[PDB]
Amino acid sequence: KKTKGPDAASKLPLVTPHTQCRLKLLKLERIKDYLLMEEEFIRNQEQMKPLEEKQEEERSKVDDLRGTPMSVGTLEEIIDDNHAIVSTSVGSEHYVSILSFVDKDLLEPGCSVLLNHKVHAVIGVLMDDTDPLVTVMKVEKAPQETYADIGGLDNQIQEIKESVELPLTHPEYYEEMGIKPPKGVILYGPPGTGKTLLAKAVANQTSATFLRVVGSELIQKYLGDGPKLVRELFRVAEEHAPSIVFIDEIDAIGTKRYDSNSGGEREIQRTMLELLNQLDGFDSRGDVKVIMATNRIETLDPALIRPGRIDRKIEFPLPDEKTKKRIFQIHTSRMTLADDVTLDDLIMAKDDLSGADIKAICTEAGLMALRERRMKVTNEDFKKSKENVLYKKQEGTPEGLYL
């Protein structure tokens, strides 16, 4: 089936104007109108169409034959058409009889098999055994951001778009030459320079089944559970239709391997080895594309960054001049700036000013405004923020050593 389960989101086609206006009022009213229409119709048609001759007496029979508290067990070497061996959670090998309700196909060794509580008997198949610690990594409420929200990263955004969106948007463009679409881009750069922002942007216009990881939640405390959570993650990814898995902060399980002496620093190594094996090893990999974000690309073990497993290493740098003004424009819009607080000045000066710094200056600026009892930011309210947000930073060479 390989269901291409989307983020089950986008219930907000997005209100076009963000300035409080009757246009906004009318559009959101239309949204509510269709939502109420849907609710009404579904309820009404549930109540109507008197199919009360339901339950399909026969399905009632099946439920009757499969008693209460059915148990979850692992099927094992299947012996005969009408007979098979099962292994309960205590690891006890009962010898049950496969009843007729079970489709003889779909029951392969290692597939979780339902059972009758009293007389162990394979009653039905279960095709949803995803580790409850892995299903919690499927994004089902798409983060609210768009490529326009991010700014100043054209070249660094087109690269991700050419390996997370276009390959499934116009795949003819790629086959026409036969080059296999690039798979896996590592977004490395200094702290507070995007990275996660671009990740959420690509999550928004997904068209796929985004899986989110943490970079530390993979590590597990039971020998082997580590290098099986990753296996389950990518099994789910390949079972579901085209997907992109963002293994954020891969600096955690990525340290350069070494002849260690501890045990934890060997289990983590085994986890990285599982990651490498599956991402590019004897196997394949369908339409599964991996996005990795890190703060230090020099620490990642050469292997998890190779031009067959992670191509298109993006180099998100500290924002440049024009990008700074762009980001200020994008992050100062929804504020009632005065007529003398043009941002064309706060740029420059310090050569160290990241996007996080920009948003901090823009927020502790409105907060500063709410101190003279005003709702229109002021140039003093901005010049008093550089001395309160950007501080504690380190410095450089002593003047005189060079010019």
């Binding site: 399905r59 006890s92 049950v96 007729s100 309700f101 026409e176 296999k180 039971y222 031009p307």
Partner: protein
């Protein structure tokens, strides 16, 4: 001098600003947010309780016949037999994890049909013996066979002829032509471990062998070799080799054996204890007072220096094979192989890109052939050009993503 904010101050602040229709906007947004919840609640996740074959294909039997299946045919429990007292009908069995017992043989089964070591179908209540069970073939162990033919031939594995010949001398000829090894009586070397920098085709050649193995090519998923409960790994490896010694000419590949193998030590938590035990079982099986037979082992690693000595020494792995970076001819052939399916202009000189990609590996050669027509797709052409490929090389390798030496740096002329 920062006086706080008073309640009246907040109240006035909330109402002096442009909100002609803004209270309504917030209210409607809240209504939408509270309406989504109702909609999904009433259309919740259903129709997911699968596992039911369509009681239409066998609909007729999908009935009281099932109950007839139930009730009779008591569900048995598996168990082994550790003895069978001769001329004394008593048997002794060890079920599995519960306990041992002494059992009587049910009348329905003749004693001759039941032997020592076979799996019996002991019943509940009074543990009597019934229809014997055939020997187990574990699911994890049996889910390892290649059972396919990966789409990679030897031809596509370019840039290394000596390496391929070395591998073939142990993986193919010693099984597909024993004659050459008898006239001289040379014992076919067994155990080939492939080194190499990260990414050079070490796994490509392993895959290529699978396309002509004409036998089993069990692929050790090292991650599976380690499990929570102690002894699980040792049993896993023992079953691996026992199924190995059941066919003709079985080859077992241990991809990234660094995971299971490592220098032993008792300092940190007594080492890995369990992992080291699994490694020791593997070493004993490979070499010991129990000749293996007709099973060969191929293993690959990025760093052989971190392998336990009792496994790097000959005997366990004889034919070590460096997989060094390709030579000029190797690079040219590699480019040609990973360019034969590309819409490239005919006048492209691939002998030049090879020089312009020094100290690169096969994965880099790929990432250059690709991301080469990617610039063409960016330009919206259809036949990439030599300029495109050269720009790709300059943007992939040599300078890759970081070129510090540039500002007035021309000292190498």
């Amino acid at each position: 001098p920062i006086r706080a904010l008073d309640e009246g101050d907040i109240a006035l602040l909330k109402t002096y600003g442009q909100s002609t229709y803004s209270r309504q906007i917030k209210q409607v947004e809240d209504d939408i947010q509270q309406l989504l919840k109702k909609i999904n609640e009433l259309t919740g996740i259903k129709e997911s309780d699968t596992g039911l074959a369509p009681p239409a294909l066998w609909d007729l039997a999908a009935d009281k016949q099932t109950l007839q299946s139930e009730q009779p045919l008591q569900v048995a429990r598996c168990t082994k037999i550790i003895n069978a007292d001769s001329e004394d009908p008593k048997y002794i069995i060890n079920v599995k994890q519960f306990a041992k017992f002494v059992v009587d043989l049910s009348d329905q089964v003749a004693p001759t049909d039941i032997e020592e070591g076979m799996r019996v179908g002991v019943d509940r209540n009074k543990y009597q013996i019934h229809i014997p069970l055939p020997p187990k073939i574990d699911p994890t162990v049996t889910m390892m066979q290649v059972e396919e033919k990966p789409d990679v031939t030897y031809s596509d594995v370019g840039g290394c002829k000596e390496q391929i010949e070395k591998l073939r001398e142990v993986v193919e000829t010693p099984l597909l032509h024993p004659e050459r090894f008898v006239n001289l009586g040379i014992e076919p070397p067994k155990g080939v471990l492939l080194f190499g920098p990260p990414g050079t085709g070490k796994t490509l050649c392993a895959r290529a062998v699978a396309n002509r193995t004409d036998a089993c090519f069990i692929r050790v998923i090292g991650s599976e070799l380690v499990q929570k409960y102690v002894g699980e790994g040792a049993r896993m490896v023992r079953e691996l080799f026992e199924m190995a010694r059941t066919k003709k000419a079985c080859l077992i590949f241990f991809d990234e054996i660094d995971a299971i193998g490592g220098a032993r030590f008792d300092d940190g938590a007594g080492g890995d204890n369990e992992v080291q035990r699994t490694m020791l079982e593997l070493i004993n099986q490979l070499d010991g007072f129990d000749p293996r037979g007709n099973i060969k082992v191929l293993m690959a690693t990025n760093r052989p220096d971190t392998l336990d000595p009792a496994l790097m020494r000959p005997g366990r792995l004889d034919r070590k094979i460096e997989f060094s970076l390709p030579d000029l001819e190797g690079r040219t052939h590699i480019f040609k192989i990973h360019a034969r399916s590309m819409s490239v202009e005919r006048d492209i000189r691939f002998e030049l890109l090879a020089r312009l990609c020094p100290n690169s590996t096969g994965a880099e050669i790929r990432s250059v052939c690709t991301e080469a027509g990617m610039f063409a797709i960016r330009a919206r052409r259809k036949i990439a050009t030599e300029k495109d490929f050269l720009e790709a090389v300059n943007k992939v390798i040599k300078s890759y993503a970081k070129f510090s030496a540039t500002p007035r740096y021309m000292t190498y002329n």
